[PDB]
Every structure is written in structure tokens, then in C-alpha cells.
Scaffold this active site. Sequence first.
Site, mmCIF file in Angstrom:
data_model
loop_
_atom_site.group_PDB
_atom_site.id
_atom_site.type_symbol
_atom_site.label_atom_id
_atom_site.label_comp_id
_atom_site.label_asym_id
_atom_site.label_seq_id
_atom_site.Cartn_x
_atom_site.Cartn_y
_atom_site.Cartn_z
ATOM 1 N N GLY A 83 29.955 29.589 38.372
ATOM 2 C CA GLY A 83 30.944 29.982 37.825
ATOM 3 C C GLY A 83 31.678 31.661 38.204
ATOM 4 N N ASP B 181 27.542 45.189 35.055
ATOM 5 C CA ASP B 181 27.828 43.899 34.773
ATOM 6 C C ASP B 181 27.091 43.793 33.653
ATOM 7 O OD1 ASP B 181 29.172 42.052 33.841
ATOM 8 O OD2 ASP B 181 28.967 40.942 34.811
#
EC number: 2.7.11.1
Length: 273
Positions: A15, A135
Amino acid sequence: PLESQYQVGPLLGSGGFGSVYSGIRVSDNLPVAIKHVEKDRISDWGELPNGTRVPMEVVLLKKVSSGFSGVIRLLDWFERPDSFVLILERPEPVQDLFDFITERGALQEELARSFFWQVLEAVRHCHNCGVLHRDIKDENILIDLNRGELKLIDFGSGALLKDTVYTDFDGTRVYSPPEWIRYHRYHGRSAAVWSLGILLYDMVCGDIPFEHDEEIIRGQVFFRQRVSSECQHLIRWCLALRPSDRPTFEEIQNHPWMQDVLLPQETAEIHLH
Ligand SMILES: Nc1ccc(NCCNCCO)c2c1C(=O)c1c(O)ccc(O)c1C2=O
């Protein structure tokens, strides 16, 4: 020397951050993860002590890979002509927190408490080492199913921690604080605390609280699941609209909901075996 020293196995995921594979170090059979990042998708570079041009992710991981902690450690890295390859620790057996919550629904508070505590310890460790993750979320957290130990993993959107304002962000929007949504500015610690309030809600409700920008900015939290009056209080505190009304790490860890945490091992005995 890279394809001699490690044996590659199945793809673990792919990803934004690249492609990561299961691997083993031939030397001794240490389980490892082999992460490939393309040069062309690195927007953000730094330099090591000895002074070469690497992805910030490598600088950050080296700064936190010292000693033990709840961070997945960088064992080695390699440069190729169009990519960097990172060799990381790999716990075995392991499941990422996103998949765990996807399979089991909202976590019991005792388990959320244990997990959330270990995340706070890992984040303090990072902040101590001069690193901001930026994150923090369920898919960047691995669970070692046998030891009950959580590990933080993807430093690709991270930065050196500083005390002035940040005006760039590349993590996940739905975890990003309202000051980022409205002004394109945030300070590290307090943005990290907001992301922690999203994470905790996610844990105890089995889903994130906000999906659109207007929800983030409005900052009103609704519980779809039976949650304690305390856990709710901690969550709404982390999710204060004003950065300065958010708790510090210390105040999170001293909150009444955070008392009597289980140790990792007993966590895995009760909840994961
Ligand atoms: N994206 C992933 C997706 C899944 C994953 N583990 C798969 C094990 N089967 C349970 C599904 O979550 C990993 C990763 C990683 O990115 C991952 C990593 O980036 C570093 C060390 C690792 O052990 C891992 C890692 O174990």
C-alpha cells in the site's frame, strides 16, 4: 549480499508505504519483515550520523531502534538502484490491530486498557528519542499474540520532533486533528494526543468516530456501544477541539481509566489464548 542473507517468504502487505514480505535471516532463522520502498515515492529524505542520503523513515527508525521498546526495530537496510529495502523485526505469531478489531469487534475495556497503555509507552519512547510518528492508528500497530505485546510499525510519515509548528502532514486524514483540517497547522504532541483519542475510541467501539471533515471540526463524539463513564471522559479529553485543552501523556497515564493495567503476559493469557 541482500538475497544471500535473507530468505524471502509471502507478501505480508502492500500500500502507501510500499511492499512488505515475510522473511528469515539465514545466519540464524530470525523471523524478519522485508520492506521495499521505491525511491520515486519518497518525498522526504534525511541523513545519518556518518552522512549519506536516506529516507527519513531510516533516520527515524535508527533513532528509536536502541534498546527494547514497543517499536519494531530496524535490523538492517540496503539501497538498490530504484528502491530501499529495510529489514525489520517480525514477531511470530502476529496480527495487526486493524484485523484484530475487524475480527473481534469492540474490545473489552480491560484489553483496550492494556493495549492503549502499551501504545502510550511506545509513543513516549519515540518522543523521547526525538521522533514523531504522525500516523498512529490501528493498522500501524502489531500484536504479538503469544506475549500480548504491541509494536508500532510504519515511520514513513514521521518526522523529527520539534517544538514549533508543523505545516505538512501525510498520515491518515480521519486521524488528523481539527487544527490541521482548518488551518493546515499543528504541534506534534498535541496532534499525537488527538490521534490517540481516535485510536482509543476505535478500540472500545470497533470503529472510528469521524469520517468527514465537518465531523472532525465539530468534534462531537457519539457512542454506539456501552462504554464506561470514565473511558468516555478520557476519549473526549484527547479529542478536545482546542490543542491546549488536550491532556499531556502524563495526564493520560494518570487518568482514573488507566489505573490497574494488566501486564502484557496476563493480557495474552486472559484475552488472546
Ligand atoms: N503491513 C503488514 C500487514 C500484516 C502483517 N502481519 C500479518 C500476519 N497475519 C495477521 C494479519 O494482520 C505485517 C505488516 C507489516 O507492515 C509489518 C511491518 O511493516 C514490519 C514488521 C512486521 O512484522 C510486519 C507485519 O507482521
